[PDB]
């Protein structure tokens, strides 16, 4: 559509990716503690 639509879509995927990586780094700390 228009450029403002694709920005919201890339932002949505970027925030979900950020949330997922933060969860993975938290598990990696649990592995480190184990």
């Amino acid at each position: 559509x228009v450029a403002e639509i694709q920005l919201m879509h890339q932002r949505a995927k970027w925030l979900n990716s950020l949330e997922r990586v933060e969860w993975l780094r938290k598990k990696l700390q649990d592995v480190h503690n184990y």
């Binding site: 228009v2 403002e4 639509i5 920005l7 932002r11 925030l15 993975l24 990696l28 184990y34």
Partner: protein, 562 residues
Amino acid sequence: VMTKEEQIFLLHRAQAQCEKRLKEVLQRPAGRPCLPEWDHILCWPLGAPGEVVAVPCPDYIYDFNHKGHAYRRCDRNGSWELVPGHNRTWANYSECVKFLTNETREREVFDRLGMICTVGYSVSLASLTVAVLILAYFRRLHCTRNYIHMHLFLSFMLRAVSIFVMDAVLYSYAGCRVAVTFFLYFLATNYYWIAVEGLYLHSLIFKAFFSEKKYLWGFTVFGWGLPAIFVAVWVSVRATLANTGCWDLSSGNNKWIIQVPILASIVLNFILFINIVRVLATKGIDCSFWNESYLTGSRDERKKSLLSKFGMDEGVTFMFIGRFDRGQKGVDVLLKAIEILSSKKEFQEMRFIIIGKGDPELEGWARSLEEKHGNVKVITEMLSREFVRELYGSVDFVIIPSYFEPFGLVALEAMCLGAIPIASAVGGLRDIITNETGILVKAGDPGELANAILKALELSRSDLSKFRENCKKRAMSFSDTRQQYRKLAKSTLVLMPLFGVHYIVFMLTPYTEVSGTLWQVRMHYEMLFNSFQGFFVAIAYCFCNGEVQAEIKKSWSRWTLA
């Protein structure tokens, strides 16, 4: 596509599989191996004493390098190798986390483009709010033309409110769908109200007479109704098939049932644009100059003095002024018509003044008639427009035998000065001249022009003052109407192709570059253009409008009185 919740579910399943595997091993113990155990991410197998154990990076972890392996070591006794200094099991995860040091580089692009969005839409909303308030405050600015502008202003204002709602719920599911639906509706009303601006301007020019109230009612249904139609069809086709993402409109063919109606308005605007520019001249006549009130004495006195300067007696005077060419301005048609009339007895009552330059053979032909007949004057030198105005206000008829004439500004100049036009029924002369304000003839026909000149001579035997007055009112009311339309077209003819060409170019440019040099320059420019669209419309229809500026200067002068 992969959510944090989805990874949690996949990790829970992997943990349950590890618990079952360990129970199957404990029921049949043998030897001294390292036992399986769950370390919160993956399940380790049986370990042989003194051997390194490698496990491929788990599939259920989306962000891992799935071509690498995690590592452990098993003691000679049969215990997993520990971390030195602590009672923790040691492991090597460097390969799985290899390409997982991304940190943030995309933040720079998303923050810049998002700032351009908020800045551009804020300036657009602020400029549109003061624009709609000015048009509603001053009572002198209340007309159908400004009512259409206020509808166009409101559509861009609601579009700005929609994106502020979209990024608000983004900063924090069905609430997102209604947000993008309202945005696509307002986006469609913007392009359809631009088509309304083109239809209104095209109607003022090509419709001699219509009802503005009824047209405004049809424009409201066109601008707000039709976008709601194919957007509702869009929501109907969308929600039924599945329940995909909120902002991935471009992925499926569902986007074409909304882009096509928007494209249809752009094609309609290109049609209206071509019709208007072929008929509406870029600049009118100098109204401050072409006025008979600049002349002194009566028209009879001015014509007698004029013909005396050329060395002729009084008579019905016909004038031609224009380029001497073969198939355009039509001086060849006039010269042939003068030869046809030269054998008539009525020729002695006529006077001819031919002014122009161009083809040498037509210049010699004109000079030949001037030398052959004592009632024909030819001027090939350059004349000031003061002397041309003297001729328009002294002669009886002006002959305009053009083969084509899109605007006919020469007719309007002569008619404003009382000269009755005899012109070809082509182009603008056809729309300007009627039976009560001139004589029209078929183009390229010397006989029809000769007969029209004969009818003009018989007409001159009676008083022509009333005929001259009708020609003045016609030229004055035609140029007044044209100058009013030109002010509206000064901005409408700019916004129609600007929005249309940008939309088509941006639609034909794909998202293939994926944050490359091409991608960042397209995303930066399209965000700048789309965000300041309301600011562009506010300037074109209010801040640059001559009536609006004159009203704020009137208010500022009353507030600044020494």
